[PDB]
């Protein structure tokens, strides 16, 4: 007997392929919705958000983070690496102007 | 005129030491010789030593 024991990286590449061609929202609805309410409650209390309003916020935030992750990933190969770093994000936001 | 004229051991003196800053020049009149530029600046300073 012997376990399959996939090496690190190969299943991650498979998850890349299975999710780049996918369409469904990766972030769960209620955890993202609850995060919106607590952020808005610091600006204005007793505030409501429509279901399509949270849906519009969710896709825009995912695409912005995905595009940030592509810049984060492309900086890794630029830095002769395959693992992203917290400093990799900070460089990406600075170059983007954020 | 020329490319090597100095009273001491020359360092390719113009008439100015080339390869050096402008605040190193002296235009005094003394006995100047060439001697094939002190036999190739003292045979490359005894071969760098």
């Amino acid at each position: 007997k012997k376990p399959h024991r996939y090496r690190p990286g190969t299943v991650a590449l498979r998850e890349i392929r299975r999710y780049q061609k996918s369409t469904e929202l990766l972030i769960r609805k209620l955890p993202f919705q609850r995060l919106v309410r607590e952020i808005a409650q610091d600006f204005k209390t007793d505030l409501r958000f429509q279901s399509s309003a949270v849906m519009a916020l969710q896709e825009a935030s995912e695409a912005y983070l995905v595009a940030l992750f592509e810049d984060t990933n492309l900086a890794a190969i630029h830095a002769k690496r395959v693992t992203i770093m917290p400093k990799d994000i900070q460089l990406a936001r600075r170059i983007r102007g954020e | 005129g020329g490319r090597c004229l100095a009273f001491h051991g020359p360092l390719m003196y113009e008439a100015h030491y080339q390869g050096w800053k402008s605040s190193w020049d002296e235009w005094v009149g003394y006995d100047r010789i060439r001697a094939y530029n002190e036999e190739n600046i003292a045979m490359k300073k005894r071969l760098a030593n």
Binding site: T10, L13, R17, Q20, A56, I77, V82 | -
Partner: protein
């Protein structure tokens, strides 16, 4: 988008097809560079050094 729908043998145009059509065309990519498309994802590409 119809060509992309024919690539994955689909009759109905879905928002993934619209996103694939926009990003594949270099004229549409620059025109809609600052444009977010909902339910579209991104281009399924892998870096050369990231391949096994």
């Amino acid at each position: 988008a119809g060509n992309a729908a024919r690539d994955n043998k689909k009759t109905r145009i879905i928002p993934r097809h619209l996103q694939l059509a926009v990003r594949n065309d270099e004229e549409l990519n620059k025109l809609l560079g600052r444009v977010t498309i909902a339910q579209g994802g991104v281009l399924p590409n892998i870096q050369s050094v990231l391949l096994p």
